[PDB]
Design a protein around this motif. Structure first.
Motif, PDB file in Angstrom:
ATOM      1  N   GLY A   1      -9.906   2.355  -7.808  1.00 42.42           N
ATOM      2  CA  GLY A   1      -9.244   3.104  -8.641  1.00 42.42           C
ATOM      3  C   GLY A   1      -8.434   4.286  -8.167  1.00 42.42           C
ATOM      4  O   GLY A   1      -8.586   5.161  -9.193  1.00 42.42           O
ATOM      5  N   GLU A   2      -8.115   4.526  -6.816  1.00 39.91           N
ATOM      6  CA  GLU A   2      -7.619   5.505  -6.657  1.00 39.91           C
ATOM      7  C   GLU A   2      -6.087   5.509  -6.159  1.00 39.91           C
ATOM      8  O   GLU A   2      -6.091   4.693  -5.161  1.00 39.91           O
ATOM      9  N   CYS A   3      -5.098   6.015  -6.771  1.00 41.35           N
ATOM     10  CA  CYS A   3      -3.768   6.022  -6.353  1.00 41.35           C
ATOM     11  C   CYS A   3      -2.939   6.676  -7.351  1.00 41.35           C
ATOM     12  O   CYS A   3      -1.699   5.998  -7.519  1.00 41.35           O
TER      13      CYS A   3
ATOM     14  N   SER B   1       0.817  -1.094  -0.032  1.00 44.87           N
ATOM     15  CA  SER B   1      -0.015   0.061   0.010  1.00 44.87           C
ATOM     16  C   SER B   1       0.841   1.372   0.012  1.00 44.87           C
ATOM     17  O   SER B   1       1.774   1.214   0.806  1.00 44.87           O
ATOM     18  N   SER B   2       0.669   2.238  -0.764  1.00 48.46           N
ATOM     19  CA  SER B   2       1.259   3.471  -0.916  1.00 48.46           C
ATOM     20  C   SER B   2       1.045   4.229   0.252  1.00 48.46           C
ATOM     21  O   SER B   2       1.712   5.221   0.704  1.00 48.46           O
TER      22      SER B   2
ATOM     23  N   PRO C   1      -6.426  -3.987  -2.999  1.00 46.91           N
ATOM     24  CA  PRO C   1      -7.316  -3.969  -3.898  1.00 46.91           C
ATOM     25  C   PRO C   1      -6.944  -4.994  -5.124  1.00 46.91           C
ATOM     26  O   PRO C   1      -5.805  -5.648  -5.142  1.00 46.91           O
ATOM     27  N   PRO C   2      -8.109  -5.331  -5.923  1.00 46.74           N
ATOM     28  CA  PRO C   2      -7.742  -6.205  -6.686  1.00 46.74           C
ATOM     29  C   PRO C   2      -6.724  -5.557  -7.861  1.00 46.74           C
ATOM     30  O   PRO C   2      -6.694  -4.434  -8.068  1.00 46.74           O
TER      31      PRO C   2
ATOM     32  N   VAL D   1       6.373  -8.282  -7.541  1.00 47.87           N
ATOM     33  CA  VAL D   1       5.337  -7.318  -6.725  1.00 47.87           C
ATOM     34  C   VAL D   1       5.966  -6.151  -6.419  1.00 47.87           C
ATOM     35  O   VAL D   1       7.096  -6.002  -5.648  1.00 47.87           O
ATOM     36  N   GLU D   2       5.358  -5.254  -6.873  1.00 45.87           N
ATOM     37  CA  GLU D   2       5.942  -3.652  -6.761  1.00 45.87           C
ATOM     38  C   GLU D   2       4.847  -2.631  -6.204  1.00 45.87           C
ATOM     39  O   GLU D   2       3.513  -2.940  -6.597  1.00 45.87           O
ATOM     40  N   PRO D   3       5.074  -1.699  -5.980  1.00 46.79           N
ATOM     41  CA  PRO D   3       4.184  -0.508  -5.456  1.00 46.79           C
ATOM     42  C   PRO D   3       3.423  -0.220  -6.812  1.00 46.79           C
ATOM     43  O   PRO D   3       4.111   0.107  -7.851  1.00 46.79           O
ATOM     44  N   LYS D   4       2.073   0.132  -6.758  1.00 47.34           N
ATOM     45  CA  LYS D   4       1.263   0.374  -8.238  1.00 47.34           C
ATOM     46  C   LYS D   4       1.432   1.858  -8.482  1.00 47.34           C
ATOM     47  O   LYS D   4       1.171   2.656  -7.441  1.00 47.34           O
ATOM     48  N   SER D   5       1.883   2.079  -9.613  1.00 47.06           N
ATOM     49  CA  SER D   5       1.976   3.588  -9.828  1.00 47.06           C
ATOM     50  C   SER D   5       0.461   4.091 -10.428  1.00 47.06           C
ATOM     51  O   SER D   5       0.051   4.976  -9.942  1.00 47.06           O
TER      52      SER D   5
END
Lengths: 218, 214
Positions: free
Chosen positions: B212-214, A134-135, B119-120, A214-218
């Motif tokens: 859908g938020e980040c 999680s960011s 999240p998915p 597995v990496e932080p989501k951009s």
């Protein structure tokens, strides 16, 4: 030392048949009453069938839940007891132990168990999806290992270099008949920008091997 | 058949404690109750025969008592190798039957879960399915309540939980709760929330995200 050693378990479709075998040593086999006892999470331990000694006509006895479908037999020259199963049902699934019952009292010796899985599901490798950190101290991340059959899969992290703080959850059977699990790991938040994290998934029944970064989501 | 009721299903023991567990037969069974130990990934092992007779090679801390319908197995000071499941069995009459088992677990001080929500992934969404994962990490005791809320609607029937075995080093459990929806259903809503109730938390913890938020 007394030893009971079962073999023959595996995967079979409902309506199917399968024969289990057990080889005994360390006691006078033909004097004793040999049993099959099965174990499942839903029904616990259940006696299945018994075959007594030839000295008393080697009489056979069956649980009502398997009578007419299972046949127990023995070959004293081979110190072997067998369980022939037919018309198998999903609820016959479980671990089947060979066991000696001491003349109508205790089950005083047990084998190691052989696994029977009765299912109509087709063999299939998993899809692997990232559980991205999680960011928003300690971070958690993981891999979702979804829709495979049958058990098991193995999951490592960074080819086995990462073991501390890993939790690979027990698989859960989905209503589809396929299994799903997650493997997660907690790591220092500061390491997310310096260390890569890859789960290595192996599903031997389908010859599927998957590495997912597995990496932080951009 | 004769039914054997074992209680409790889960007994928590502090290292050094004297413990006992119970087996109640649905009718008279004389002294024909036998006790078994089954360690993780192991086979049943006969410990006590005919209510109170110890098997040779079984340690002296095990003892059984009882007659008629109510039976007890005792361990006078549990050792770590005693952490296992325990089963009773009757041979009073045919067919022979087993209790449902008592699990012996390590008792420790309360530890709150660390809660995380995932999240998915975009990859999974492209496949037509959405799995939302709520993680409860390293907590004790094992009892926890996890509720999913989607745009404030409490969810039922569309999640599955999984719990690890008790950790060999810190005696905690970890738990996952996975919410599964179709892609269309997932995309109909915005706020996804996991609410966790546990004795170690002074108030229930909610982790949530906006789709859908980040």
């Amino acid at each position: 030392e007394v030893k009971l050693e079962e073999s023959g378990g595996g995967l079979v479709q409902p309506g199917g048949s399968m024969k289990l075998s057990c080889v005994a040593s360390g006691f006078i086999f033909s004097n004793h009453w040999m049993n099959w006892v099965r174990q499942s999470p839903e029904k616990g331990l259940e006696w299945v069938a018994e075959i007594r000694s030839k000295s008393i006509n080697s009489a056979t006895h069956y649980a009502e839940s398997v009578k007419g479908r299972f046949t127990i037999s023995r070959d004293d020259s081979k110190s072997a007891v067998y369980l022939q199963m037919t018309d198998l049902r999903t609820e016959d699934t479980g671990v089947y132990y060979c066991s000696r019952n001491y003349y109508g009292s205790t089950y005083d010796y047990w084998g190691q168990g052989t696994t029977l899985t009765v299912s109509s599901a087709s063999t299939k490798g998993p899809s692997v999806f990232p559980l991205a950190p999680s960011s928003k101290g300690t971070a958690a991340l993981g891999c979702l290992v979804k829709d495979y059959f049958p058990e098991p899969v193995t999951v490592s992290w960074n080819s086995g270099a990462l073991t501390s703080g890993v939790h690979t959850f027990p698989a859960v059977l989905q209503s589809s008949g396929l299994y799903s699990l997650s493997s997660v790991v907690t790591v220092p938040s500061s390491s997310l920008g310096t260390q890569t994290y890859i789960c290595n998934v192996n599903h031997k029944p389908s010859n599927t091997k998957v590495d997912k970064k597995v990496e932080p989501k951009s | 058949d004769i039914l054997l009721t074992q209680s409790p299903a889960i007994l928590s023991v502090s290292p050094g404690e004297r413990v006992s567990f119970s087996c109640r037969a649905s009718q008279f069974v004389g002294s024909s109750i036998h006790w078994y130990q089954q360690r993780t990934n192991g086979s049943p092992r006969l410990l006590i025969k005919y209510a109170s007779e110890s098997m040779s090679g079984i340690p002296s801390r095990f003892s059984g008592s009882g007659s008629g319908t109510d039976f007890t197995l005792s361990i006078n000071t549990v050792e770590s190798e005693d952490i296992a499941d325990y089963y009773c069995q009757q041979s009073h009459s045919w067919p022979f039957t087993f209790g449902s088992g008592t699990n012996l677990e390590v008792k420790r001080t309360v530890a709150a879960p660390s809660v995380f929500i995932f999240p998915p992934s975009d990859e999974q969404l492209k496949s037509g399915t959405a799995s939302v994962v709520c993680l409860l990490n390293n907590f004790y005791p094992r009892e926890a309540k996890v509720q999913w809320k989607v745009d404030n609607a409490l969810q039922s029937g569309n999640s599955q939980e999984s719990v690890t075995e008790q950790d060999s080093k810190d005696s905690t459990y970890s738990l996952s709760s996975t919410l599964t929806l179709s892609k269309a259903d997932y995309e109909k809503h915005k706020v996804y929330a996991c609410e966790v109730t546990h004795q170690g938390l002074s108030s229930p913890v909610t982790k949530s995200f906006n789709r859908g938020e980040c």
